[PDB]
Amino acid sequence: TSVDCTMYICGDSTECSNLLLQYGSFCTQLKRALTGIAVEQDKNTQEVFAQVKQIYKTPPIKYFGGFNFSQILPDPSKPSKRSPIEDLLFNKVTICAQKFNGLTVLPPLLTDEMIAQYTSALLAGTITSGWTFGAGPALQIPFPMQMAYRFNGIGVTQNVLYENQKLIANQFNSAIGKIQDSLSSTPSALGKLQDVVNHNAQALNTLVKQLSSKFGAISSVLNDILSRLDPPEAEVQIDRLITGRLQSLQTYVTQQLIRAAEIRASANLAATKMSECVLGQSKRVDFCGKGYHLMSFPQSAPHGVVFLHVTYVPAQEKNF
């Protein structure tokens, strides 16, 4: 977002700018703060997404040992180059009068198409080349070759995979089928991104409704005051309205700098999980989900990321 200090505080009135310039040295700091939060916010996405400088594409034929990944790979027959999971994440997540008071919003540098291309390239790297592509060149490995080594990373001999790969395929395919209806069953799981959107929205709304305020003045309108009173008097009514609006700006941008702090921390944590849960098989328990972690799938979302962690839990046990 960006604000114009002159247009918010004053309309098309020269004298209001004259009484603004005798303060003078306030909204330049507002400008530098909004530009700083802008350059901080748009720079977050590269280390979250552009961790690889080698964009990849999927092979046309998928002999993946009986596995199915059609839900997460983007569909060429779809007009957008997105997965159906991306479509559910997009349509499950949901102005001009706000803009028309000198309250501008800036489009992101990265739009949905090339971040979808980043996610597709990340999926292509993590399926056909394993996890070695995060180090140097991508080294192509068959998928059941890789899952045996991933089992070996969790203290499992590779004979278990080559004995039960059919059951593994059925279980994983059933789980991927379950997760679509799991996401579509309730919208409470998507509450972690609606909160940021409506928190920004209501903060902007309570900013823009602050104009109609009787800040010690005869009227909150600026033009009718000019047609009302002489220029020596009513400066005492103008300046209090100036102060009451600049304090509102101060409370707004202070809250914005507060809210950017945890967003940056969450983005850093998401980039760390991008590094660990995707490009490697971290043995840090509960850091990549719940239980012993095998691997993870990233999917983009409006102003956010979602991770599908595939992990491992035992079912039947006996005493000896």
């Binding site: 080698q54 594409k57 992101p108 991508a138 068959p142």
Partner: protein, 411 residues
């Protein structure tokens, strides 16, 4: 705009990147004032010049209906003494329309003229008269020593100074007003404490300056009301379409462009206040036509340049403004990115690595010319996949990389 960038950054050299400047802010072409055609002559002489008015105890609070008047009728009296006004300065009681003017006329002495000011106590501001202290209206007084004064003395005029209980602002109190005070029932006929609340004035034309008869008219009103009652003549002019223009519709004003009707309203519903509590739809004072107000579009101007050590060929961009339009003059090329309009730069179908971001995956670089291009994600790569093939590396390198972390700033 390179010099404007130097002006903004208070330095003679700028290295690279995007910057900020002011907006376009197109100006209105003209101003439109619309008044209803019902313009009559509003009678004000009956309260200004007439026979001998009543005293201060009797108020001729007059309701002035829908009419058209100006200050020329008021201006007929040179002996105006108390020209002090509140709410609106006296130089601009014209070309603005009120909603309910409250005119009240009385006759008071010279020293009682200053007592009509609000927020004080005096002979009039006591139990005789209480007035609202906000007082959007005004007080106009003029001497009438040649008409109201009498050779035999004007003892008939009275005033109710000694009323018992308090008065509230804008109240009528004319009655017998029997006086019952003291620690005894007076009954109006006792004799000890039968004080008279009404006393005579005395007007003979050999006095001092503070005992002269003065006609005082007081006006009380308010504002911000949709109907208009009385204001001066102004020639109404036709409206305009799709043009940045000022408008004044019987009081409240604005500046923007106008659009035809799209909604239904309700046949006494004429205002169009939005969720943002701003006026955006109104009907004509002369015709029943719904029109929509949208203010003229702002700009938002940003500058892009290579190094001042490198070159000086710059370009500018306008955020949100469509060009395809109202950008005064043009340059060599105009481009219409979804981030906004862009001039001073060319466009290619090629793809190169981005040096400075612009918005929506657009980046501008330096070749002898500034070139704007779409996002290049990197080198396109594909790896062959087989059911029985392993890539295995044989040679390797060790690499050293740098990381810079701040630790603490200056105490």
């Amino acid at each position: 705009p390179l010099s404007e960038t130097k002006c903004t950054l208070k330095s003679f050299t700028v290295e690279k990147g995007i910057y900020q400047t002011s907006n376009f802010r197109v100006q209105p072409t003209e101003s439109i004032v619309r008044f209803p055609n019902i313009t009559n002559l509003c009678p004000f002489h009956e309260v200004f010049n007439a026979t001998t008015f009543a005293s201060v105890y009797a108020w001729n609070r007059k309701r002035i209906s829908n009419c058209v008047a100006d200050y020329s009728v008021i201006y007929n009296f040179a002996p105006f003494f108390a020209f002090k006004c509140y709410g609106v300065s006296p130089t601009k009681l014209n070309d603005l329309c009120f909603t309910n003017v409250y005119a009240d006329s009385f006759v008071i002495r010279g020293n009682e003229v200053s007592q009509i000011a609000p927020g004080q106590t005096g002979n009039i501001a006591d139990y005789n008269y209480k007035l609202p202290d906000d007082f959007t209206g005004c007080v106009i007084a003029w001497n009438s020593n040649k008409l109201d004064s009498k050779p035999s003395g004007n003892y008939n005029y009275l005033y109710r100074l000694f009323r018992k209980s308090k008065l509230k602002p804008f109240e009528r109190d004319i009655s017998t007003e029997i006086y019952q005070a003291g620690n005894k029932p007076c009954n109006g006929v006792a004799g000890p404490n039968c004080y008279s609340p009404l006393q005579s004035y005395g007007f003979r034309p050999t006095y001092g300056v503070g005992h002269q008869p003065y006609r005082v008219v007081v006006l009380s009103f308010e504002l911000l009301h949709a109907p208009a009652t009385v204001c001066g003549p102004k020639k109404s002019t036709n409206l305009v379409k799709n043009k940045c223009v000022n408008f004044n519709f019987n009081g409240l004003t604005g500046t923007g462009v106008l659009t035809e009707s799209n909604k239904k309203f309700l046949p006494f519903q004429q205002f169009g206040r939005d969720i943002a509590d701003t006026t955006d739809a109104v009907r004509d004072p002369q015709t029943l036509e719904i029109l929509d107000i949208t203010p003229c579009s702002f700009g938002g101007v940003s500058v892009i340049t290579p190094g001042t050590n490198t070159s000086n060929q710059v370009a500018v961009l306008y955020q949100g403004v469509n060009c395809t339009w109202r950008v005064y003059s043009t340059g060599s090329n105009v481009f219409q990115t979804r981030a906004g309009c862009l001039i001073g730069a060319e466009y290619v179908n090629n793809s190169y690595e981005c040096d400075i971001p612009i918005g929506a995956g657009i980046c501008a670089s330096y070749q002898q010319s500034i070139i704007a291009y779409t996002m290049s994600l990197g080198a396109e790569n594909s790896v062959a996949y087989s059911n029985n093939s392993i890539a295995i590396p044989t040679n390797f390198t060790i690499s050293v990389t740098t990381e810079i972390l701040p630790v603490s700033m200056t105490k």
